[PDB]
Amino acid sequence: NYAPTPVDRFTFGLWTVGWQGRDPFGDATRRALDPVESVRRLAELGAHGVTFHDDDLIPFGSSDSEREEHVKRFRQALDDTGMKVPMATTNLFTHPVFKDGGFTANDRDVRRYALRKTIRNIDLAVELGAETYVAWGGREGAESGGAKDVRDALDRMKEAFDLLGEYVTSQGYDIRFAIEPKPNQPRGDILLPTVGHALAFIERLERPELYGVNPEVGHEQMAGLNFPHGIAQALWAGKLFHIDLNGQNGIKYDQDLRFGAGDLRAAFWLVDLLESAGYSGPRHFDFKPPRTEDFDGVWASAAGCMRNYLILKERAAAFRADPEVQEALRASRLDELARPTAADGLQALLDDRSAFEEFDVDAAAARGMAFERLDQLAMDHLLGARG
Amino acid sequence: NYAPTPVDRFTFGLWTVGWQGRDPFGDATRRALDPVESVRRLAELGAHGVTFHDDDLIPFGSSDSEREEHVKRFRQALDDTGMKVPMATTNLFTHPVFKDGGFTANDRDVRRYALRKTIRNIDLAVELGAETYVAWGGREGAESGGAKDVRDALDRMKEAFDLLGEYVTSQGYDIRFAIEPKPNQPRGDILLPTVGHALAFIERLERPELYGVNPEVGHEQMAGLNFPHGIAQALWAGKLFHIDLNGQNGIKYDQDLRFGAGDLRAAFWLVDLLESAGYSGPRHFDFKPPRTEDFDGVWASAAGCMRNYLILKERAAAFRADPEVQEALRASRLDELARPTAADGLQALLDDRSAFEEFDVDAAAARGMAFERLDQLAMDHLLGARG
Amino acid sequence: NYAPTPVDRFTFGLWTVGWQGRDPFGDATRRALDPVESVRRLAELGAHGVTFHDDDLIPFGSSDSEREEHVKRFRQALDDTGMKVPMATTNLFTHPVFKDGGFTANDRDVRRYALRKTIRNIDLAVELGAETYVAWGGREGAESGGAKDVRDALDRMKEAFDLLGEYVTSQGYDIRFAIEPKPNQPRGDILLPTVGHALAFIERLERPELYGVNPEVGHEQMAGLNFPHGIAQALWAGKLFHIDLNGQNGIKYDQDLRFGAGDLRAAFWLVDLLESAGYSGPRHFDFKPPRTEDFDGVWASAAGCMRNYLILKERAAAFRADPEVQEALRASRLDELARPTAADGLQALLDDRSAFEEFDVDAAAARGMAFERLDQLAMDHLLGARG
Amino acid sequence: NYAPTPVDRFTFGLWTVGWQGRDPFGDATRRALDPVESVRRLAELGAHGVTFHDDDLIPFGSSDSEREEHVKRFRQALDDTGMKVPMATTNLFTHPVFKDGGFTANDRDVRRYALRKTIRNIDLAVELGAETYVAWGGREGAESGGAKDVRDALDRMKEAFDLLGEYVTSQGYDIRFAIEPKPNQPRGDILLPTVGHALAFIERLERPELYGVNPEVGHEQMAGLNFPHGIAQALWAGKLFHIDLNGQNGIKYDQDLRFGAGDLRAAFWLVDLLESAGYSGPRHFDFKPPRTEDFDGVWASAAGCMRNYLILKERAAAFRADPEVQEALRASRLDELARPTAADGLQALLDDRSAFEEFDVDAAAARGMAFERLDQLAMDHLLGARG
Ligand SMILES: [Mg+2]
Ligand SMILES: [Mg+2]
Ligand SMILES: [Mg+2]
Ligand SMILES: [Mg+2]
Ligand SMILES: [Mn+2]
Ligand SMILES: [Mn+2]
Ligand SMILES: [Mn+2]
Ligand SMILES: [Mn+2]
Ligand SMILES: [Mn+2]
Ligand SMILES: [Mn+2]
Ligand SMILES: [Mn+2]
Ligand SMILES: [Mn+2]
Ligand code: NA
Ligand code: NA
Ligand code: NA
Ligand code: NA
Ligand code: NA
Ligand code: NA
Ligand code: NA
Ligand code: NA
Asked: Where in the sequence is the active site (chains A, B, C, D)?
């Protein structure tokens, strides 16, 4: 039951199942995986595709001949399995040169290098068929207040993204960009810390249509925010270009648990939203099998990501299709929320005594919302306990 | 020393010093204050002005004659003291009718009433000389996932703000709107939970130039975010129309401590930013004297808000003016951060071997940022411990 | 299905279903309930009993004749329904006199009054058959560092609890005390903020056997802690005298959602622990039906607390009884965790070359824990998705 | 000014200034330091001593001859500088063998090895003159609910600490143990997550007098708790055997900022408490110079830890010595808090009409606490803004 197929568009980063287990306090617990191994194993589990940072696929500093051989082997694995590559990204965070940032490093020479590193990888992403290019500015930020003038840093970040937009336009590429917010870690505070801040920034770019967001479940939850609500705002703005699925237990370091772990009810409401809205992008997992696991546990954890999505999809669909739930949604006036407040227009509203002088505020205030019954129907559906 | 004057544009809500001390668990500890009393006492402390919700100035449900008398007495107090009213707002949160929201209530009749209540108060705000009209949507949100379709709620919130913009345009008013984000409390999650989400929303309004943000120190800190960073993004966007100053100890219920309490170093960096950027708006305090205090403690707490701002202003100015700090800022390359990455343009960057093939990444990575020395100079200046 | 019966020992505070809906920003949305009404309605839902603060049952300041009549009516309702009263507590937080504390108020006269108020209610609790007397020191704490010397406050808190222990001993009562920790709210920081701090304090009382803890789900989660882990430590110490069940979404104000809401997987692990350990006390709900609800929603929310406990009980029992789970627990060495490290004793351990010189650390480190497979079996059982 | 001397008992872990800068996302930015270098540089800054994990001083897996040479070189550096070694600890977290724990690993062979590794290092600590042996159980915990039975884990943790107590008793050593709590990171939840939980656990050991706590500023703040309050409880219990000083910005990953950074006002109240209580132990810094820094920034950051302690010590002493503050403390009844509630005894309290029938609750409730004036005097003293 709940068996994933490529149809479900489940994707995984090479760095997810390939995470060797090094953490702030501990050495690696697993050997490095050849990307070819990961592609073949993920395909066997029913994944649709993989994603990569440049330096996951091509060791940093590789010669041109080494780069070609790494890409050739990877493409053979994709061809052997039918796996796709819908998204790629640049590693602008691991190498010590990026310790103060890539695009917003105080040192101008580093900013220029970061752009050139990204541009090289955009070319590769396009050659592999990627539709989306993600940017996670994990080093953009500060541990202290004097270190980073945020207005200047935002100017530099806009300049960088505008140059990348000029680049893809000039080459005729169809790829689009997706900015991944995170509030903190590894920097004390990271620039563009939430979906909202990223959406706001995009509106000030020269070609805003080329940019959207790549929200990650656990990153919004590291600020204690409601991930489904933030996804709703991204959808409302037309900017949900990609998504990163995982789990998180609240306000902690970025745990990258398998999807469904962490906040299970938020996972339910997320799947309900994505499916109801008809989100058509990859269901991408940015997770880490815990370092306690051997490789059998790696593949079990990856399989669990997909399984949990499919269980939640079934339960959310049953919730929405249940005539008792539909009645409860009407009892709670969800239908009214979807109707305009004043399609009659401003003057008619100002002239409408039913909206002020003759509005019976105490009668209105007496009406219960019936939200608790609705929520218990949702709980019963999630748990398969209807009756 | 540190004596405030009206020149400093310090303002206070009537509901701040007038808070009677009722909390989730406790009855009022102070009698209600007449707004006339608050105006006269605040003026004696050196405040510039006050702000109000409709229902702070005019008891809910007052007749027209009662409304006129309350406003007349208030205006006499303003005239007697020279106090101004730079900002006003609507209470769309206390009355039970607003239990599911004002502008985004599921019930359409409530949404229409909320708009009419706001419009009536915009007229009054203009008559009192206010430049800014704040909206704090404290009831807009949910405790459960099925109760509120966030895309529909954002449609209703946009409709409401668009109607208010049509209204002020039609009346020829110069007032502008400022949206106050908050992540949670009293709703489990509130819509537009951060400065970023509010900035992003504004960009989708029909007349975005009429709307900005009113960020509150403690509200951003309730999501664990960096308040100075968020203010920098608002300034970068040209949207810092007003600000609410207070203190907060991290991720808790909204404490509304006096300004300078809570995160003292964030208060220092905030004042540094506001003064450096030339922010010209009110320095408004949205705080609550703790319920442990009698009226002498109320006025002591209000005086402390202003005193702490003025101490921090002195220390931040001394930091920026110190030639040793200026040298440390150059050592940390803050000057370079402010210079364009690639004013030479995209093609020149692509052709520049110094940005890629000839970039010595290990030499770059070896350079220290010297941020710790800079931050200790900042600490020494804040504490008055230079030497 | 999942129908509660008095056998299940589900109990509710009068103040839970009776909460009128006043919050930091909003007036009451529901009329006050007569305790007689609440007893009869809860009995109809299958509750076992109720609990009370003194001032929930007897209005503060009542005369002796008024007190007798309120108690008589309540006892008739209990007799009419078969409902029990297993626990009672004192309200040392609502009245303004308690603004700086009860037992740890700086004012000595208030501390003495708080003790007398509690002692009067212990007598009543015993007359009603209560086995446990809870103390929630919600006003014990501070908003500022100079206001409360914590060593002195702990001396006063120990003195108070020691006097109460002397009192019950002297009267021959069998009741025991349960201290309810909370980290903050309504005070900026509350003394004894977690289960651990309360357990540690109890060990320094003169008669520690008379005192245990009353942990509340949401209070531990307000510090981001793992509630099942804290309950395990309380059980390990022999100190889980009572428990408060509810839901919470992480690090926020105390939400008091119905049980099962908030962190659903933590609720599953909690029920698994309570049932596995054979906890025999009341399953008490300290929750608040949201202020959006009318009375039908109040009773729906209360019914949901019990329903969710019973669903989780079924799922946790099925998890523990499944031979595949039992095999996975052995694969993860949960059996070994339960066996002594060195029953052979210290000298034998020191002499055992297999514990040092001949321990193959790399072979040990290569063994996977198989925790992800185990956790996915747990998820499948919780969701009823085995297969 | 503020120049540290060995008299001040400032100490640093080898792993602090020696941190190479590897984080969850980034490679090392600094070369490894020879412990001899660190001892000599710290001495030049005015430190009193250093501390070590076994594997900081002796590379894991060293032969006996290699171990002797590493210790000999270190002891020569200590002799050359006058630096002391007051504390040592075991690394039971870095090596992959400890991925599920040391003392509470599910695998019994690992638990036995962890004990033998610790015992070997206790012998070395004693030879170097250490008075305290710290245990930080950073791997004791879980990412999932089924992986770790916490009651069984606490049994194993008690067994381990009891064996270590038997060991030191049997060898006649004067060293004592200090348990360092942390709530999470690197495990999803760590056992004994706060000072309170550790204090409670110690009370159940066979020889509790041999064990205390080593609280760390940032670890308590990762649960949003008040660090000075927790230190007060440890002092009240007689269990503050050692302390780790650093900074933290709230509920995040463990930042290990220099002391004084993060929550500056909490640092002030901590120093006030330690000095007022006469804490006589090391002032130990467990911090990490940010990875942005070169070695000059490492030593600047270490110097800043000590400088900030000394500034705060001066300001707290001036606060306590100021006759205006002493008057404000009396106005706020801090003197009364320190006096027994009922030295007259239980019967006299029960017979005292002034404690109940004749207690004027409204007159008591009208008295203001004057805490805001007191706190503003504290702010003025911290900032050196008295006047
Ligand atoms: Mg629709
Ligand atoms: Mg500039
Ligand atoms: Mg057992
Ligand atoms: Mg004393
Ligand atoms: Mn992540
Ligand atoms: Mn991601
Ligand atoms: Mn606020
Ligand atoms: Mn505000
Ligand atoms: Mn609660
Ligand atoms: Mn409770
Ligand atoms: Mn730490
Ligand atoms: Mn430490
Ligand atoms: Na700039
Ligand atoms: Na979209
Ligand atoms: Na709509
Ligand atoms: Na602006
Ligand atoms: Na005392
Ligand atoms: Na127990
Ligand atoms: Na055991
Ligand atoms: Na002590």
From this structure: 53, 56
Rounded distance, CA A184 to CA A331, Å?
Answer: 41
Of the candidates C106, C191, C340, which has its C-beta nearest D332's C-beta? Answer: C106
Q: Chain C: nearest CA to B119, how far in angstroms?
A: 22
> CB distance B229–A144 less than 8 Å?
no
Contact A240, A284 (CB under 8 A): no
Give the side-chain half-sphere CA count within 13 A for C172. Answer: 0
Specify the CATH number of the domain B1-387.
Answer: 3.20.20.150
CA separation for the pair C97, B145 (Å, rounded): 40
Tell me which ligand sits closest to the C-alpha of residue B338.
13
Q: Report how far Cα B339 is from the mean position of its chain's Cα atoms.
A: 30
Largest CA distance in chain C: 80
What's the distance, CA A95 to chain centroid? 23
Distance from CA of C187 to the nearest CA of B (A): 9
Pairing of strands C141-142, C189-190: antiparallel
Report CB contact under 8 Å: A185, D24. yes
- Residue in this structure with the two tokens 């900042």, named with its chain if needed: B378
Q: What is the DSSP letter of D180?
A: -
Residue C2 tokens, joined: 């999942």
CA–CA dist B360, A375 (Å, integer): 59
D183 and C179 Cβ atoms separated by less than 8 Å: no
Cis peptide before D186 (omega within 30 of 0): yes
What is the resolution of the experimental data for this entry, in Å? Answer: 1.2
**Helix-, strand-, coil-residue percentages of chain C, each rounded to 5:** 50, 10, 40
Find, among B235, B241, B44, the residue nearest to B131 by Cα.
Answer: B241
**The dihedral of CA C325, C330, C331, C336: what is its sign?**
positive
CA dist C304 and C359 (Å) reads 53
Distance CA B241, CA A347 (A): 28
Domain boundaries in chain C?
Answer: 1-387
Pairing of strands B189-190, B141-142: antiparallel
In whole angstroms, give the CA distance from residue C264 to residue C253. 18
Identify whether the C-beta of residue C171 lies closer than 8 Å to the C-beta of residue C215: no
- Terminus-to-terminus CA distance in chain D, angstroms? 23
Q: Which helix (H) or strand (E) holds D337?
A: helix D334-337
Of the residues C15, C20, C25, C288, the best mutation for testing chain B's interface (the one with the most B CB atoms within 10 Å of its CB) is: C25
Rounded CA-CA distance D228/D217 in Å is: 9
DSSP-derived letter for residue B96 is: G
> Nearest Cα to C209, choosing from C243, C171, C245, C162?
C162
Q: Are B107 and B100 in contact (CB under 8 A)?
A: yes
Residue C354 is classified by DSSP as G
Find the CB nearest C147 among D142, D350, D371. Answer: D371
Nearest C-alpha neighbor of B282 from the set B7, B1, B57: B7
**Interface membership of C297 toward B (CB under 8 Å):** no
Cα-Cα-Cα-Cα torsion C318, C319, C323, C328, nearest 10 degrees, comes to 180
Amino acid sitting at position D374: L
Ligand nearest to the CA of B159: 15
Q: Supply B162's token pair.
A: 């668009």
In chain C, residues 190-219 whose CB comes closer than 8 Å to chain D: 191-201, 203-204
User: Could you report how far apart the first and last alpha carbons of chain A are, in Å?
Assistant: 23
Cα dist from C254 to A107, C54, C224, D305, whole Å: 46, 22, 12, 36
Alpha carbon distance D96, A27 (integer Å): 6
